[PDB]
């Protein structure tokens, strides 16, 4: 499990559950090719997006549909989605956890890259 | 204006208006002595708390009452307040802007220090 | 000044100066058309990007090149850039301040929207 | 395990390891009584601070010594420590995770309160 995503809700103080997201990998034509997708679990986590063999060096984009999440709660959000764009590099550690902390008008994202 | 505090509301995407705060300074006996206090304006800023002459080297605490802010908006939040504790003017006089970004279960605080 | 962007450096506690960014607007064909661009000033702010007449209803993307910022400081950061994507002026004209707080492995973005 | 603390380093994109913290509970005299303490593990987490029987309703303060952490890395921090002050309430969910995301000039803290 080289890539995991964890999403938290700063309004309710809870995991953000059932949040959809799509991952894309940049191709040579400089367009985003679909790579992986899913919805967060009851822990706010999405596991199993890819495998070590499939996740090679490259530029990846994680698009988290935050707008649908807030609309389901009845709170008017600012952003269309939260996007996280990064290069995977083999000199660095093996595992990438992308964390996102969501508020209606604000979000933060942090990468925890470990061995 | 050597010390300014700016407070923002991450739920509404707005300045946080009428937020009370109290500033304290550590005394020689290691107690917190009252220093200055005020409330944020319609811009979410609190200016005029002190002067260059009065704000001497020391350890200062800014206590922002976030709980009353959220309760007035109908929200029961997690934190009693947001505390910011720092040494000031150790190297000579500086201008300090303390920023706080508020959500019911989360907050962030950042210092911008200029010379 | 209907759109302003403010960028801060959480490592140094300073405005993030000379940070490039490009703004795009979604076209009728669902592509991102160039809208405006610039670099932050010594205050970490970028003003004058557009006018009330030019900034019409639409979906906008602000792409802040954080990677070049960190590399110039000797830091190899996680993200390629920080993207902020939002619908603007849906309810009529508003003033938008997009704030970004930068660390090498983490960033936050907040919108302050006033009328 | 009703109370856990998780600390992340936003500069290095890693758990914040060996971070000391002290927890206090407010007494009737309105002073902070020592309650629990420890250092974060290699995962950046501190478990086992208290038990369900001992953690009763009350006002608690978690003081995280962020200054010593940055000083060990050779980066000049702004804050003396990061403080998280909150009321434990039995009407809410059982488990409290206090998360802290650290930068030298900025930190955020979030409570995830779950069942």
From Swiss-Prot, chains A, B, C, D:
Annotated phenotype, changing residue 52 to K: In AMYLD1; amyloid polyneuropathy
Residues annotated as binding L-thyroxine: 6, 45, 108
Name of encoding gene: TTR
Documented effect of changing residue 105 to C: In AMYLD1; amyloid polyneuropathy
Documented effect of changing residue 85 to A: In a patient with amyloidosis
Protein name, entry field: Transthyretin
Glycosylation sites (chain numbering): 89
Subunit relationships: Homotetramer. Dimer of dimers. In the homotetramer, subunits assemble around a central channel that can accommodate two ligand molecules. Interacts with RBP4.
Species this protein is from: Homo sapiens
Post-translational modification: Not glycosylated under normal conditions. Following unfolding, caused for example by variant AMYLD1 'Gly-38', the cryptic Asn-89 site is exposed and glycosylated by STT3B-containing OST complex, leading to its degradation by the ER-associated degradation (ERAD) pathway. Sulfonation of the reactive cysteine Cys-1 enhances the stability of the native conformation of TTR, avoiding misassembly of the protein leading to amyloid formation.
Residues the record lists as 4-carboxyglutamate modifications: 33
Disease per record: Amyloidosis, hereditary systemic 1: A form of hereditary systemic amyloidosis, a disorder characterized by amyloid deposition in multiple tissues resulting in a wide clinical spectrum. AMYLD1 is an autosomal dominant form due to transthyretin amyloid deposition. Protein fibrils can form in different tissues leading to amyloid polyneuropathies, amyloidotic cardiomyopathy, carpal tunnel syndrome, systemic senile amyloidosis. The disease includes leptomeningeal amyloidosis that is characterized by primary involvement of the central nervous system.
Effect ascribed to mutating residue 38 to V: In AMYLD1; amyloid polyneuropathy with carpal tunnel syndrome
Effect recorded for residue 24 to I: In AMYLD1; Jewish 'SKO' amyloid polyneuropathy
Effect annotated for changing residue 115 to S: In AMYLD1; uncertain significance
Residue positions where Sulfocysteine is found in the record: 1
């Amino acid at each position: 499990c080289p890539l995991m995503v964890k999403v938290l809700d700063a309004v309710r103080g809870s995991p953000a559950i059932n949040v959809a997201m799509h991952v894309f990998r940049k191709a040579a034509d400089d367009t985003w090719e679909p790579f992986a997708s899913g919805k967060t679990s009851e822990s706010g986590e999405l596991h199993g997006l890819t495998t070590e063999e499939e996740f090679v060096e490259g530029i990846y984009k994680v698009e988290i549909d935050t707008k649908s999440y807030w609309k389901a709660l009845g709170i008017s959000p600012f952003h269309e989605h939260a996007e996280v764009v990064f290069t995977a590099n083999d000199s660095g550690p093996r595992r990438y956890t992308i964390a996102a902390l969501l508020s209606p008008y604000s979000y933060s994202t942090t990468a925890v890259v470990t061995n």
